[PDB]
CSV table of N, CA, C and O in Angstrom, one decimal:
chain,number,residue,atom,x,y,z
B,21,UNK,N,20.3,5.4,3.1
B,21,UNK,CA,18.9,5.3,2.9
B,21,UNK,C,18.4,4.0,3.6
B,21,UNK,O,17.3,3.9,4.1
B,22,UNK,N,19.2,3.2,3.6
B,22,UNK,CA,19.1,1.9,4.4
B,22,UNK,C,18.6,1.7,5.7
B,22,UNK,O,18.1,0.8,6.3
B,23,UNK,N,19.2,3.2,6.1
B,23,UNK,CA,18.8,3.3,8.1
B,23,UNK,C,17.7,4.0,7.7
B,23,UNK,O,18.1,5.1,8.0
B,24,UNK,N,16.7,4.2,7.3
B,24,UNK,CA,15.3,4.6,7.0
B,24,UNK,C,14.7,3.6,6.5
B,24,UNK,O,13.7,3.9,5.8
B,25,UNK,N,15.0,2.4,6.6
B,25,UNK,CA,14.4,1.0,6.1
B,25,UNK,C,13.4,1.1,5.5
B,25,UNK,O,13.4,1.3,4.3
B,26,UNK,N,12.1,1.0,6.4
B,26,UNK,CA,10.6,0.9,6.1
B,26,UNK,C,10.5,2.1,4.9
B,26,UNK,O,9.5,1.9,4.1
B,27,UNK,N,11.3,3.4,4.6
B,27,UNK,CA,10.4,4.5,3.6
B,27,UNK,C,10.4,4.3,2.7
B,27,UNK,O,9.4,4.8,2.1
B,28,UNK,N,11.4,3.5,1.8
B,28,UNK,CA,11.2,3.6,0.5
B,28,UNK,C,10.0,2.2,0.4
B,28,UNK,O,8.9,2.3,-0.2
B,29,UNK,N,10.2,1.2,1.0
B,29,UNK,CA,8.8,0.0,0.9
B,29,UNK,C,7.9,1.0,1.0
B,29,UNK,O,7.3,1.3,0.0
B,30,UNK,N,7.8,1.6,2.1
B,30,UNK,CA,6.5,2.1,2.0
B,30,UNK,C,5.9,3.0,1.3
B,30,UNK,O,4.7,2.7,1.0
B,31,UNK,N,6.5,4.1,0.8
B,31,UNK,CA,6.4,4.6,0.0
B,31,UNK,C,5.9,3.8,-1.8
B,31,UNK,O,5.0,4.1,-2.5
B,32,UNK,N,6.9,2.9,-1.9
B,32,UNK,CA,6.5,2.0,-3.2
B,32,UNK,C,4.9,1.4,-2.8
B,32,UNK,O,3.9,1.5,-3.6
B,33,UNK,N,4.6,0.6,-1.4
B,33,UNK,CA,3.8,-0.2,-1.3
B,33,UNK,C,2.1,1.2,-1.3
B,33,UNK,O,1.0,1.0,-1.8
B,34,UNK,N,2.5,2.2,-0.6
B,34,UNK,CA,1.2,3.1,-1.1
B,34,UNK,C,1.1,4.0,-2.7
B,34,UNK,O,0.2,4.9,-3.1
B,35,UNK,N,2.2,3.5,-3.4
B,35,UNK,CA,1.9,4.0,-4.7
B,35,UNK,C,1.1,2.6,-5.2
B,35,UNK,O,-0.1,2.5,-5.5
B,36,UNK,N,1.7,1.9,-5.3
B,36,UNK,CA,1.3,0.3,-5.6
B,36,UNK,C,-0.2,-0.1,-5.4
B,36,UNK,O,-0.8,-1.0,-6.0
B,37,UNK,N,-0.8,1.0,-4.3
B,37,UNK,CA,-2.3,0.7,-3.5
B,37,UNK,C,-2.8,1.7,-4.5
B,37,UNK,O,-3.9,1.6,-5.1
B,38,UNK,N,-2.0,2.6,-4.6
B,38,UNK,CA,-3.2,3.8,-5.4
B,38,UNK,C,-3.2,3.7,-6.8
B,38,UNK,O,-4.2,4.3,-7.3
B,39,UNK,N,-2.3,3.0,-7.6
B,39,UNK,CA,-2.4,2.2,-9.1
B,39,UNK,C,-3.0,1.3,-8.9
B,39,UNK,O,-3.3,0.8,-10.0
B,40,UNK,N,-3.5,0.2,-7.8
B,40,UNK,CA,-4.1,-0.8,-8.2
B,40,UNK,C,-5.5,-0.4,-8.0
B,40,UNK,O,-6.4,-0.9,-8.6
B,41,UNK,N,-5.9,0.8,-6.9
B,41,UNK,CA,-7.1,1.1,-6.7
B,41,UNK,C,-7.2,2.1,-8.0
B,41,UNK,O,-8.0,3.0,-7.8
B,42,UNK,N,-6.9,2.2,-8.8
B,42,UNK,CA,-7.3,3.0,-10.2
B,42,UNK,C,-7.4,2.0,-11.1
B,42,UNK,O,-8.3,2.1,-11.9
B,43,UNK,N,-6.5,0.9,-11.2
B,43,UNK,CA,-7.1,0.3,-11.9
B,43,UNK,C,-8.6,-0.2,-12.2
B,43,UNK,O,-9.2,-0.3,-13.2
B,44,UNK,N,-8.8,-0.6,-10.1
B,44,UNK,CA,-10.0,-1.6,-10.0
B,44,UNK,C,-11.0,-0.3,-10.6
B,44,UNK,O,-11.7,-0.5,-11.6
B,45,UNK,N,-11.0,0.8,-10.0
B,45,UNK,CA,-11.6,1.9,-10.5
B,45,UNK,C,-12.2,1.2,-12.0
B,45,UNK,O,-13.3,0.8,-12.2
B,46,UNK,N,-10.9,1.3,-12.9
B,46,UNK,CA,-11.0,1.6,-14.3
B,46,UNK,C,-11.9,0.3,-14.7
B,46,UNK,O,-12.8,0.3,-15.6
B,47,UNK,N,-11.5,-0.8,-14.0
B,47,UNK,CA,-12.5,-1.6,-14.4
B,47,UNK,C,-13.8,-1.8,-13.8
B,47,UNK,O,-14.4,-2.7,-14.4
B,48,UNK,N,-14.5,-1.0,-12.6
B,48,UNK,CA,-15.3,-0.7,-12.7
B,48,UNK,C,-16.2,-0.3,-13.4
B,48,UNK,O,-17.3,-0.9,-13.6
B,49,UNK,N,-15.5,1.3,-14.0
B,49,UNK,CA,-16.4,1.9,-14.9
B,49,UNK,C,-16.7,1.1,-16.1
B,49,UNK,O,-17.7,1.2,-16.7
B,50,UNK,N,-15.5,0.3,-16.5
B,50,UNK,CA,-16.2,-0.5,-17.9
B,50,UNK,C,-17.0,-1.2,-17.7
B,50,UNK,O,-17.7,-1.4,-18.6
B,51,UNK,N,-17.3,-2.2,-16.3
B,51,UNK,CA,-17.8,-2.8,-16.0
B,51,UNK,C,-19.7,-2.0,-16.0
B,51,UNK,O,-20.7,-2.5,-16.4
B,52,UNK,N,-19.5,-1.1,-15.6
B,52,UNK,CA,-20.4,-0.3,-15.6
B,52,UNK,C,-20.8,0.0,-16.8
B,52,UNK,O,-22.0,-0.2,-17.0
B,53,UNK,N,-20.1,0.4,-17.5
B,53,UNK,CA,-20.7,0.8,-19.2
B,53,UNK,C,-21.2,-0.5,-20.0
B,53,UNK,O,-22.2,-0.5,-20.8
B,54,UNK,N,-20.4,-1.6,-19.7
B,54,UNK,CA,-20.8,-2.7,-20.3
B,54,UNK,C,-22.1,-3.6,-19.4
B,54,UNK,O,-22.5,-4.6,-20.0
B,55,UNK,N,-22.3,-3.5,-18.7
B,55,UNK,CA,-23.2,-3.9,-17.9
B,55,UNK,C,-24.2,-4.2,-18.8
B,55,UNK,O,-24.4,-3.2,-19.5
B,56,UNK,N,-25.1,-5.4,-19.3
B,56,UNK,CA,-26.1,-5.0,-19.7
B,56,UNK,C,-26.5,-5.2,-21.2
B,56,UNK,O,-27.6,-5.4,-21.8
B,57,UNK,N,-25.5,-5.1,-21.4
B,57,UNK,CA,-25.2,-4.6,-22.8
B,57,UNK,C,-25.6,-5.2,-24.3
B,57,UNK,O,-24.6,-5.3,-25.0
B,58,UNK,N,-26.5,-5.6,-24.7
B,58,UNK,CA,-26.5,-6.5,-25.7
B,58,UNK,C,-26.8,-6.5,-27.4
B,58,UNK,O,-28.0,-6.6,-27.8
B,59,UNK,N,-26.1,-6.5,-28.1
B,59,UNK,CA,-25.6,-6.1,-29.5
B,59,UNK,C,-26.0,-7.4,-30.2
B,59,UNK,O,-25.7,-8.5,-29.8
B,60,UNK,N,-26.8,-6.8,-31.8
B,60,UNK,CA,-26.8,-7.8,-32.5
B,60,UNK,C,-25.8,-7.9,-33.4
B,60,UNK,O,-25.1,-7.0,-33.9
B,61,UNK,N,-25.9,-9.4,-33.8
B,61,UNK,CA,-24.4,-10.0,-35.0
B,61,UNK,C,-24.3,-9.0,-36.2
B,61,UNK,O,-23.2,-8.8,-36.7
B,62,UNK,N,-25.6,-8.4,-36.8
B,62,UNK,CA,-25.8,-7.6,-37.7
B,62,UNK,C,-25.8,-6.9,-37.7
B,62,UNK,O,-26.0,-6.3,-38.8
B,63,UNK,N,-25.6,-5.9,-36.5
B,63,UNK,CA,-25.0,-4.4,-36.2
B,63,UNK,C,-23.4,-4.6,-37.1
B,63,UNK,O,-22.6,-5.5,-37.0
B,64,UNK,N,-23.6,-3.3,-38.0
B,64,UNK,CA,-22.7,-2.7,-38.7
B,64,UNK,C,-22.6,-1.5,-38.9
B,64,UNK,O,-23.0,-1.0,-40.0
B,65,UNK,N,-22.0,-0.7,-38.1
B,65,UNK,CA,-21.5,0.5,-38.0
B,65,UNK,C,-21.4,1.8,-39.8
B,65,UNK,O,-21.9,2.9,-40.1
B,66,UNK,N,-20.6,1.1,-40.3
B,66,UNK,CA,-20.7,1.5,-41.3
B,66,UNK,C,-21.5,2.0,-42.3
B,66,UNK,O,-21.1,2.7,-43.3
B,67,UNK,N,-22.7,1.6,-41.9
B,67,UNK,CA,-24.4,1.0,-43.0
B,67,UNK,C,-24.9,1.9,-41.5
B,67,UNK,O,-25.0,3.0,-41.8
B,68,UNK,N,-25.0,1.8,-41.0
B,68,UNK,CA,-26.2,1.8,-39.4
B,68,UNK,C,-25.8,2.8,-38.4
B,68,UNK,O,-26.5,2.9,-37.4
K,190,UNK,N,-15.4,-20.6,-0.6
K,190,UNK,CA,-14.1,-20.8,-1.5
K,190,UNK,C,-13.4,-19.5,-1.3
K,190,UNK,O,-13.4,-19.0,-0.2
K,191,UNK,N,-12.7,-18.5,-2.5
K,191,UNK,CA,-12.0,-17.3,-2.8
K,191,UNK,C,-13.1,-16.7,-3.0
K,191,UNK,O,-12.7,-16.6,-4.1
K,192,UNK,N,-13.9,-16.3,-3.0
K,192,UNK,CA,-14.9,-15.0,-2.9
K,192,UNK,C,-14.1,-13.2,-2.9
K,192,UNK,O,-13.0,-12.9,-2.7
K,193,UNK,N,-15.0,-12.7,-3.3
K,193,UNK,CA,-13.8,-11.3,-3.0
K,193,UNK,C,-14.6,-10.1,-1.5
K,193,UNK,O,-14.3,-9.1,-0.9
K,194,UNK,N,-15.9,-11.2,-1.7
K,194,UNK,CA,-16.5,-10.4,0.0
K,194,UNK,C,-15.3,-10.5,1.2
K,194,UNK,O,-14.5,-9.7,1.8
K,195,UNK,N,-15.5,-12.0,1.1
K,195,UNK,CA,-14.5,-12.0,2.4
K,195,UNK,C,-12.6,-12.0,1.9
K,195,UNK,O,-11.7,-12.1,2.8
K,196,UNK,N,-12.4,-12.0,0.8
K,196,UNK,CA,-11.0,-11.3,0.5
K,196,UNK,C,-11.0,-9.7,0.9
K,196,UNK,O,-10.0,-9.2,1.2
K,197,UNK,N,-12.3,-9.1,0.8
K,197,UNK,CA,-12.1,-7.6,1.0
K,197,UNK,C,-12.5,-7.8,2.6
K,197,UNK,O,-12.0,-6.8,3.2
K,198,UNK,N,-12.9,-8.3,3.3
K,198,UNK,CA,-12.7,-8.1,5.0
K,198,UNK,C,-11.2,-8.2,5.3
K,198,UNK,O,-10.4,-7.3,5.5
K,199,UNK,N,-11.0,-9.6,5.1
K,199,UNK,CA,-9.5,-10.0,5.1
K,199,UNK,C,-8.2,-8.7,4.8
K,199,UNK,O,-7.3,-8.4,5.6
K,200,UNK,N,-8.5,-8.3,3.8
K,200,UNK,CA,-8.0,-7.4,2.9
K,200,UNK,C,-7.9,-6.6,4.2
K,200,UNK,O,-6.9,-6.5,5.0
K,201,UNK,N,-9.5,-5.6,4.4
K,201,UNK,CA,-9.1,-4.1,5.6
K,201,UNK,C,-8.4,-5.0,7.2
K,201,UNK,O,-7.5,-4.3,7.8
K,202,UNK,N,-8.7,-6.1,7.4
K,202,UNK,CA,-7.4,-6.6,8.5
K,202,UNK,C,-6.7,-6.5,8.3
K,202,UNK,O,-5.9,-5.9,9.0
K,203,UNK,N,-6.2,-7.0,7.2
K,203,UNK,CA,-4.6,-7.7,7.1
K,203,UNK,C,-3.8,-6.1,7.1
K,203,UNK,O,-2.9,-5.8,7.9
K,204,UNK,N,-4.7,-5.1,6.0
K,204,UNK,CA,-4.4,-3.5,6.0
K,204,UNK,C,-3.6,-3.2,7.2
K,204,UNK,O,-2.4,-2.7,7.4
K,205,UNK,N,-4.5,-3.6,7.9
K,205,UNK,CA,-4.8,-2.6,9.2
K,205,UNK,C,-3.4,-3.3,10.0
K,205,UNK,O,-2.5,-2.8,10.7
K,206,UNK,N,-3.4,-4.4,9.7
K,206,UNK,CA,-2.4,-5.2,10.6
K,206,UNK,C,-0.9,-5.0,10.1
K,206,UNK,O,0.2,-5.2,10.8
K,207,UNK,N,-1.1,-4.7,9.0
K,207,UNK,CA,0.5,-4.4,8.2
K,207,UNK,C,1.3,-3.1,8.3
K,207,UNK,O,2.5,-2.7,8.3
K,208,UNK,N,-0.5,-2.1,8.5
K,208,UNK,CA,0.3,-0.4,8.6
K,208,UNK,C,0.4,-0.6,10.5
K,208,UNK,O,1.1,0.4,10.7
K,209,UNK,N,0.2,-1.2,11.9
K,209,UNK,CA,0.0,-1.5,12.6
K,209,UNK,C,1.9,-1.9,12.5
K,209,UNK,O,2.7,-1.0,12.9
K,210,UNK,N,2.4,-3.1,12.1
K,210,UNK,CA,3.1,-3.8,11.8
K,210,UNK,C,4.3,-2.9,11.7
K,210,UNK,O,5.1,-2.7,12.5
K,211,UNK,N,4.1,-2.4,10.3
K,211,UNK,CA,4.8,-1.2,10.0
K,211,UNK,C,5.3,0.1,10.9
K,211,UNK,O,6.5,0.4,11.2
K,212,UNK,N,4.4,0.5,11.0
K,212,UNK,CA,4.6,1.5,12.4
K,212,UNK,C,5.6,1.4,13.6
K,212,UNK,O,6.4,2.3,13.9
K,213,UNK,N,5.3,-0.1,14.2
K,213,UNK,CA,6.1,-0.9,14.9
K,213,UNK,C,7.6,-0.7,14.5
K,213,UNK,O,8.5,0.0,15.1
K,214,UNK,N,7.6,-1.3,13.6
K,214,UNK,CA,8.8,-1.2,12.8
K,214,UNK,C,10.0,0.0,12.7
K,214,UNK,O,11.2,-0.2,12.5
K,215,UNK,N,9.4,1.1,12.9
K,215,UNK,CA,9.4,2.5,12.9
K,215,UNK,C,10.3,2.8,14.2
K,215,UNK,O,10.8,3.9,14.2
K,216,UNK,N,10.4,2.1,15.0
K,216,UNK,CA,10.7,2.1,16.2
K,216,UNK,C,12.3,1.5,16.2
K,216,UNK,O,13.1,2.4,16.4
K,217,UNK,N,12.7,0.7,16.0
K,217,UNK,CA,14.1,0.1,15.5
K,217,UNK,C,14.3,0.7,14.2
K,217,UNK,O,15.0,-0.1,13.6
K,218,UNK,N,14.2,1.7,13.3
K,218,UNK,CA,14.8,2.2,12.7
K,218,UNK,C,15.6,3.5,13.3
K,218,UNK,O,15.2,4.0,14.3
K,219,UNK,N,16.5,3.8,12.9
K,219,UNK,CA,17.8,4.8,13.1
K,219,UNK,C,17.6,6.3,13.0
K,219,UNK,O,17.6,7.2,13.9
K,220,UNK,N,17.5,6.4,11.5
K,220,UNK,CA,17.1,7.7,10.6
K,220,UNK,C,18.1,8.5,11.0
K,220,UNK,O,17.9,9.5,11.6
K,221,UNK,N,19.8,7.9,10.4
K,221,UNK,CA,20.8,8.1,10.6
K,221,UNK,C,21.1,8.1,12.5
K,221,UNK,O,22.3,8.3,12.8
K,222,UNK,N,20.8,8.1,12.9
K,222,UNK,CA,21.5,7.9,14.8
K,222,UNK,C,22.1,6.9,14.6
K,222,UNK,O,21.9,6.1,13.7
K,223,UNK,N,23.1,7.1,15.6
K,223,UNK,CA,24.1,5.6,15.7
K,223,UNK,C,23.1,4.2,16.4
K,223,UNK,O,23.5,3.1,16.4
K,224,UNK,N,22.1,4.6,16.7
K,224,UNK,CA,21.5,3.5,17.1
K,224,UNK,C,19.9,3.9,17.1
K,224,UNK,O,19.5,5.1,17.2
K,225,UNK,N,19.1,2.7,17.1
K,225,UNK,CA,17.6,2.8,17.7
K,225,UNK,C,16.9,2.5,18.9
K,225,UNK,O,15.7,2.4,19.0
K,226,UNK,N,17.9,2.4,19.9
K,226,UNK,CA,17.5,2.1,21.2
K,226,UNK,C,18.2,3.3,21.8
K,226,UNK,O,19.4,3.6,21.7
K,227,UNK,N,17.3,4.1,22.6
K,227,UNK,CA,17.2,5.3,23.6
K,227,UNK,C,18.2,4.5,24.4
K,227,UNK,O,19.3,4.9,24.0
K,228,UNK,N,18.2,3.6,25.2
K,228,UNK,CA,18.9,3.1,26.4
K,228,UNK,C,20.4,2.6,25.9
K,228,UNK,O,21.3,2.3,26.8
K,229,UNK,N,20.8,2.6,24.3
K,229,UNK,CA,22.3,2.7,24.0
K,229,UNK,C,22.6,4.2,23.7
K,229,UNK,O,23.8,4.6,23.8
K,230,UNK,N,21.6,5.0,23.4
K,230,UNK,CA,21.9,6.4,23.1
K,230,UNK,C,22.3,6.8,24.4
K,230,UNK,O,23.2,7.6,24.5
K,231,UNK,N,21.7,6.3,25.6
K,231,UNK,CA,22.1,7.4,26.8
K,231,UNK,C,23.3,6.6,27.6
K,231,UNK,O,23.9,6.9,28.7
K,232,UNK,N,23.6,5.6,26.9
K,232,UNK,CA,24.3,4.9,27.7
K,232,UNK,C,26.0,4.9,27.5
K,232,UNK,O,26.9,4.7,28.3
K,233,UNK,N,25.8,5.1,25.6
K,233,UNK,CA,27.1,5.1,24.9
K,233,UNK,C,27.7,6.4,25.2
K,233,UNK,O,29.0,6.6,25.1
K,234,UNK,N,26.9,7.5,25.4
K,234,UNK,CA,27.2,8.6,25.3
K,234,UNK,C,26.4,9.9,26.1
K,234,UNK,O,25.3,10.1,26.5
K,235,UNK,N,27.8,10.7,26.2
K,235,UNK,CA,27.0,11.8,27.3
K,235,UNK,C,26.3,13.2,26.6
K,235,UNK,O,26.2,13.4,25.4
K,236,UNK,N,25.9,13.7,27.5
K,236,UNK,CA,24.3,14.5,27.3
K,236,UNK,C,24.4,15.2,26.1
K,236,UNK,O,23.7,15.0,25.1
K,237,UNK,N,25.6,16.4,26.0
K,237,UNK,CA,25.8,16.9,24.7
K,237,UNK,C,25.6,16.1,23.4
K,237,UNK,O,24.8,16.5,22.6
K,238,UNK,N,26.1,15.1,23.2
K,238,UNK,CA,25.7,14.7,21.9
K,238,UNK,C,24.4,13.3,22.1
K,238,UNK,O,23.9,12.9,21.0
């Protein structure tokens, strides 16, 4: 596997690209949902 | 300073320069042959193999 040097790096380094680009994704969207956002101390779920 | 504008320019160069890089690289690999240079392949050995 050795005399194919570059496949397994590379292979690891574009998995590596596409979990980090899902992550940024993932925090996008929260970023997105939370955008904005502003909650009072006295919000209680429970009651409200 | 670190900004992430110009981290993400940097970022599609450096990309571009590594799969570039890489590629390269591609060239001195074997992928089982006894060698990665054409000119030891024709050199060490005749046509049949």
């Amino acid at each position: 596997l050795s005399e194919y040097g570059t496949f397994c790096d590379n292979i690891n380094s574009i998995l590596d690209e596409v979990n980090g680009l899902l992550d940024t994704t993932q925090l996008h969207v929260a970023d997105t949902l939370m955008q904005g956002v502003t909650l009072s101390s006295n919000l209680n779920t429970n009651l409200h | 300073a670190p900004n992430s504008a110009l981290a993400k320019i940097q970022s599609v160069v450096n990309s571009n320069a590594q799969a570039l890089n890489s590629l390269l690289q591609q060239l001195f690999n074997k992928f089982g042959a006894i060698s990665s240079s054409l000119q030891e392949i024709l050199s060490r050995l005749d046509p049949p193999e």
